[PDB]
Amino acid sequence: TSKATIRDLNDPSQVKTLQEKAGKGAGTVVAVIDAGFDKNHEAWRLTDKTKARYQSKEDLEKAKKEHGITYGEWVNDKVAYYHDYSKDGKTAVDQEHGTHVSGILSGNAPSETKEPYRLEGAMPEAQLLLMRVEIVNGLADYARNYAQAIRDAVNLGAKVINMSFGNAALAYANLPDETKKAFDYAKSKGVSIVTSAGNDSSFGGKTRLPLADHPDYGVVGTPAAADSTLTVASYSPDKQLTETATVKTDDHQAKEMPVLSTNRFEPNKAYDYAYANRGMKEDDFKDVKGKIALIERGDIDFKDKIANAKKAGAVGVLIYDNQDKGFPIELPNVDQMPAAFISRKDGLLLKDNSKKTITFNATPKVLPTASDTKLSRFSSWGLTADGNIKPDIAAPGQDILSSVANNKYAKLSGTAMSAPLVAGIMGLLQKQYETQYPDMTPSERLDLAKKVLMSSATALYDEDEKAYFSPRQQGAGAVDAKKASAATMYVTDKDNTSSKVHLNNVSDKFEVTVTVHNKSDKPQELYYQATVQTDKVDGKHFALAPKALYETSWQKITIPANSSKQVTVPIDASRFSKDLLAQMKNGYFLEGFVRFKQDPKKEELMSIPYIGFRGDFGNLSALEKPIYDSKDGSSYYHEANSDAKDQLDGDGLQFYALKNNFTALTTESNPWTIIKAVKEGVENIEDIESSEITETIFAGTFAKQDDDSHYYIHRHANGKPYAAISPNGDGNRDYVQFQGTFLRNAKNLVAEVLDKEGNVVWTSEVTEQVVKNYNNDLASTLGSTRFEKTRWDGKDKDGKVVVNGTYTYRVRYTPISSGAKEQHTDFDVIVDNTTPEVATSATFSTEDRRLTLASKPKTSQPIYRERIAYTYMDEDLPTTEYISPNEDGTFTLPEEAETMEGGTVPLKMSDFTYVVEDMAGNITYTPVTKLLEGHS
Ligand SMILES: [Ca+2]
Ligand code: NA
């Protein structure tokens, strides 16, 4: 009972054509570096173990002895070697991601599988080297771990190394030297390394669009940033093998549609369904009990939509897209609730259908994708931090069905699924070249295979924009193993280093030079054309879509046999400067593809991308403007309150810093009750000694005298925020600290203080590496970073507190790009240690209960708050509230205080305290009874 494979029904990358030419991997070794594997899975088997490189643990150990490897172990005929390079970690091993990635590369499920179709990877007859690596300490130790796994994989005979992991926005230059030399070691040995681009979209994450003022929104990190690697983006073909559900339309026909199910529905059981809108209100699920809730994708989370139907008593849920030509999204598991994602067109069909009955099928079929041929929304954009072109190539990575833990199978999306397909195509192409080009070195075949894969890759085309997807999103195009296995030509840059042209900074007139390489015995003629395109802009945001400018005339080129010729396409986009600079004031990309055809009417034979930037890329601002300078009071990750644009509350009692992510200075607010308790030596203060809290706030913000619930920005006459410290060790506004939202990566971040008289009085420790805030999510990164090394305690380089005055707090940082000038941002910081002189005597009129102070406060900095506090006990907890002064200078003291429980507590005169604070933080707190006693 031999079952058909998934590839037998769906092979979007044409792997079968290459397999018919180069085999299925028998005798070859490939390696996978991931976070953990199910090394017992049924997908790990060989058809003929006798044809393998390592036929036993003895063959594996002999190879270990020859290279000094004293670790790792044979597992079975398929998994010839497994080693855990992060065994010292305390976290448990996750087996799903690594098993899935490996299955796409070399899965070989037998016919005895429970699945409808067998999972057969690109190289099912190759042996696997599974190597675990996970973060335990830092990213340097991490890169040192997988550098060893690379070297070991090379020395154990791996022809391909697939690395379906990464860390966003990281620069290649910051990798340890061992990691860099391991990349070169594999390359010098003809071993291919394939990296996933990442699932981080652009700056802002898969839910935001980057602002047009900042074109350097790439988020590709390491190891993908290594030039030696082949970095793979993710796209969706126009069709995909999917699970199905069928209904009856109004025309009396049977229409079956794709579904993506979390948990399982009853196979071929007729389900009823009712429309429940966006699933936000309880009334939406009025007639949802017993049926399936049809919920529109909208404003609440999927977990909220699904759980709300569970309360109403539904048997399942159907969430349909709110985007046009969108992608399926894996819905969460909410208490085993069967949840299926469907397209917007299929959802609207179900919404306006008469006989609202749907039946889920057990056998999957190939159906068109709603997205059509489209790049994945999560696939990481270039460029690298160093400014290099990534990714290199695209591969299918939407809802890929592969092997998961416990001998099971599941669909996963991600560039981690795109990579192992290209890795398998690299391995087969290299085998093909071992007979097609035997006189080459292994490094020469590797360089050729990478160039052929990129050249023959079909440049994907956005049908809505009438332009090709940006090279910064798709690389050199979608991999095509048929065109790659058949290619006898390839195209490289001017210096024959890569199949991509990096032009760095360009003006309106530039030229793209490409070398066409012919390896056939006969000369060949080609027609070539360069497309000119840039970014599409929607107002203040990038659309993350191409904007075609024009295309050049088709020109001919004849390349002699076993030779190469260069072509040059002049580009002139000067007639677009005015419009493009209006949308993208700080510069814009000028990019595209030089496409090659045997004849202009035939299909694309090769394509090489070129990328230039119209401006000064390296000197683009790396730091978002301070939040104080915002016209409307909002930044990229922070929205203002339109009713009060100067409101800027602090951290409060939040646990995570998900709010208030912008460039600013931080300080601390320390109430007087805590200053008093600390100076008196109280050990336990929080929720015991005082009801007030020490809050981290932003410098230049001050609370109103009556509310205290909100802080507001105050500014000098010029406009700068009134940032002031009082360095006296009491914890109340003693320091300033730099908080940054970095639009670009930076290096050598250092803060200094100028005395505004021509002298630097203080310099902080240097923060050598700065990573951009490419998102505002705990799962990746927050939209802001607090650099504790930039904290200034108001002291000079000798340790003495600076004299009272205004100082320039200067933050310096340099972009990663080559030769970039150092950038800086300045803040005026006032230092004032002057303790306010306040009253020492007071008389209290018993009739009106008005307290009269012997003298008004005399403060150096302007008065911040002049209040009288009363601290009463509310359920054994001293609770403090405040009283503002009258207009004659007196304070009316109440005789009772209403508690939270609704009661009333009498106020004794020993409960009142006179507190005066200036805008630098200098504070005095005197008991009112002490003032009343202030008389000889
Ligand atoms: Ca202070
Ligand atoms: Na291409």
Residue numbers in the entry: 97 to 1032
Recite the paper's sentences.
The ScpA enzyme is one of two multi-domain cell envelope proteases (CEPs) produced by the Gram-positive bacterium Streptococcus pyogenes. ScpA inactivation of human C5a (hC5a) results from a single proteolytic event between residues H67 and K68, releasing the 7 C-terminal (C-ter) residues of the chemotaxin associated with receptor activation. The structure of ScpA showed that it is a subtilisin-like protease with a PA domain inserted within the catalytic domain and 3 tandemly arranged C-terminal fibronectin type III domains (Fn1-Fn3). Based on proximity to the active site, the PA and Fn2 domains were proposed to participate in substrate interactions in the active site and at an exosite respectively.
To circumvent potential complexities expected when measuring substrate binding to an active enzyme, surface plasmon resonance (SPR) studies utilized the S512A active site mutant of ScpA (ScpAS512A) and recombinant His-tagged C5a peptides. The sensorgrams observed for ScpAS512A binding to immobilized rhC5a were well accounted for with global fitting of the data using a 1:1 Langmuir binding model. The equilibrium dissociation constant (KD) derived from these kinetic parameters was in the low nM range (34 nM) indicating that ScpA has a high affinity for rhC5a. The analysis confirms that the substrate binds to ScpA at a single site with high affinity (KDITC = 30.8 nM). The ITC measurements also indicated that the binding of the substrate is an enthalpically driven process with a ΔH of −9.4 kcal/mol and ΔS of 2.3 cal/mol/deg. Binding of ScpA to the larger core portion of C5a (rhC5acore) was also measured by SPR. rhC5acore represents the larger N-terminal product (PN) of ScpA inactivation. Thus, the high affinity binding of rhC5acore along with the competitive binding data indicated that the bulk of substrate interactions occur at a site outside of the ScpA active site (i.e. an exosite). ScpAS512A binds to rhC5adR with a KD of 191 nM, intermediate in value between the KDs for rhC5a and rhC5acore.
